[PDB]
Give the backbone structure.
Amino acid sequence: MKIYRPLWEDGAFLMPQQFQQQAAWDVHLADSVARMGLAHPWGVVAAEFDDSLLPLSRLNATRL
Amino acid sequence: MKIYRPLWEDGAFLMPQQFQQQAAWDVHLADSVARMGLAHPWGVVAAEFDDSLLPLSRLNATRLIVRFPDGTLIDTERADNLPPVCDLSTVSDRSLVDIVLALPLLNANGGNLDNGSESERPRRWKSERVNVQELAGHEQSEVAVLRHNLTLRMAHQENAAWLTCPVTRLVRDAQGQWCRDPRFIPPLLTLSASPSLMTELLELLHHLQARRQRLMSMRRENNARLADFAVADVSLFWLLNALNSAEPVLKELLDMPYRHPELLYRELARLAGSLLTFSLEHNVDAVPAYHHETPENVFPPLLSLLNRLLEASLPSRVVFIELKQKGVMWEGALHDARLREGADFWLSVRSSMPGHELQTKFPQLCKAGSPDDVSEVVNVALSGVIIRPVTHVPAAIPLRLENQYFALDLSTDAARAMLDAGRCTFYTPASLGDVKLELFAVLR
Amino acid sequence: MKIYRPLWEDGAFLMPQQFQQQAAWDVHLADSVARMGLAHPWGVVAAEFDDSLLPLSRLNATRLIVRFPDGTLIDTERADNLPPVCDLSTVSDRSLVDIVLALPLLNANGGNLDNGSESERPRRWKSERVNVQELAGHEQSEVAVLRHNLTLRMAHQENAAWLTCPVTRLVRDAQGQWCRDPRFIPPLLTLSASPSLMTELLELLHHLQARRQRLMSMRRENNARLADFAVADVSLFWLLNALNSAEPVLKELLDMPYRHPELLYRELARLAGSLLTFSLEHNVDAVPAYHHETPENVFPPLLSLLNRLLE
Amino acid sequence: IVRFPDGTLIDTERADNLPPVCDLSTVSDRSLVDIVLALPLLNANGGNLDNGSESERPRRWKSERVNVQELAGHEQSEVAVLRHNLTLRMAHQENAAWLTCPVTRLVRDAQGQWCRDPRFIPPLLTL
């Protein structure tokens, strides 16, 4: 998606894309530091549901 | 306690007691406003602790909006009052411990602060120096605001001079750690603290709304646009009358927080009264008293009572007693002596015959052993019992299996003696095959 | 009137007229809070008298807490002094005096009552000088506490440029002596300032429980009767519904101190309007309407209606 | 260079300071003396330490001013950075601070000479 990286010098000035790409870059490093969490893909650590809403044929989440 | 509100006309030298007694009197007036309708003291609004610090034992606090009974408002988002960190190495008593918030009292001759003087009598005021901004555009400056001397103590100590309110409970866990029970409830000015109560009460309303549609379905099954001449429709209309009122009141309370719990307690008490005309052997004593000092089991037994009262069968019915016996003469028990008003036997089987020649392959289809002193049917039969072979069946017989049926006529004597006896048996000795029995008596 | 908020600007000097305008605003906030649960203006928290000095005919108070309809609270235990003794000798030969408590009105031109030298206008806020200072370590110097100006007015109390709230009612006994009558009580912010009510309502509730117990003894003992179609059994089923639905609310409210009585009225009206349609031939107009501004000829005929229906 | 059970990297090369230990003979025994590192608990409303407003809850942040340049150019200026608050308490004083991490174990020799024994092991991220 062409994740750019901004340049801050004495004449550089403020934009929203200054901060959005720098936000995305350290998200992208979190996959590059996984050499087993890339072996198996991304996972699920907690998922808990409610059963009392089922006789009404509804469904609602609690923790995800 | 000799509250003296002063007057200002002219020439009065300024003096701190005017301001102090004015500020106390405003608190007292605002307390007496609240004590008109509710008759409840103060309580807990929110109390949130930290869980990642538990197995390395410490105890840190985050939000403590606790309301003390004498009118005092403790607020941590708006007055910077966090008590210091509670040690837990001083307790090897691994049963359970109870953390309670405290605040001292004794201000008839000065509840004050002088930091260079030490005493056995605690003090409830402290002072800090911050920079509060003027709210008219200028610069700020350095004033002295007050800060309460709150602290965290344990219930099994001595707590005479303080003014307490319990906040949480700790237990010991399997690896030797500390953890929090989800089962304690503090005294509450709001339902929004202690969310286990909110979970239970919402599940109560979902168990409520499940039942209404099944009863509207049972109303749709018969289409009573008329008179049924039975106890079934008056029990049905009664239970729908009990349900259709509670829902459009109990919904609005449990949508929003910050109601006082008494508004909910009156509604649950009225509903648990109206559902208790016939079902349990409990009287209205089962509706428990209200104990807002410490609500140890005012809500959980009330909820456990409601969940058992919401089954509530509708009695124009018929016995289903499973005849259990080692021998070929299967036999049950427990005949109601009420039943001799309109007793009417339509007992059943379920066999393995590809036709209606199980008529003759029920070879004892006459004079089956009714009373207590029958042993087999192939030697001890009655005199005055006719088994009618039933394949065309009168209605209202639930879970019906046709081409498996029979009625049981008797005398006036041996039937009454069997109803005194309570026991009765079946005729076929080869009935141990794919033959399953059911007992039956409808009220004429 | 015209109540004004002050602005605490930097460089705004000081005036005594500021603090009065501030302190007559939070009282108005208290009414704006409290009038989300009130029909009609207020009454008595508690009132206790000393009838021992009656053969020397006089009357004096002991403990008196009454809220007034403008938001003024009276406290003899913490803030105010007791009203002076009443002299009944000019009404020595009549039968009934109805005694109200009085504070004068407030107008926007005067103020306190300067030593009674100009006493054609009755004025409140009598001053006093008590020295109490000790919330930091010393007691010495002297402040001007404010006290109100309370009297008692009994027989031509209807000539009032005053605010009235009745407290007690005297009758001639057969030995010519006045005594306090145990009768109807001018209005209540509690159920504690009327021991006659706390004697009657406990009898009401204890009378209610026994009839329900009698009804349960009729039907729980026989298992056919729990779902029978007898024309009295249907009425008895619906009657146990009407009693079991309305017992625990009243049992909660009557195991309790102070609580405003409109709430109790809304719970007794449901029981009366339920049981009214069960064994009668009389009009729905037997239900009394609620008059709080009166001294309550509502609350005894209501209970006289309810005590007839339960037997 | 340590870490902490909430995930807070401490270096004493960048973001550094440490005050020494004043006395040691306040304990009159050798086998009980052991030193720990302490970084005070998180106050969820307040924050750093800017004056002498000593509370019952300590702070863990500070401020400082140092000379920083990295950019396109050669000029250094001054900007205010954020430095932690560390101290070396002992094992048996209190625990309203953090400690939870020993670093050494001081014992004496018989001639009045405190010296570290080799048989001590902290909890280890690395060998």
The beta strands of chain A are 48-49, 61-63.
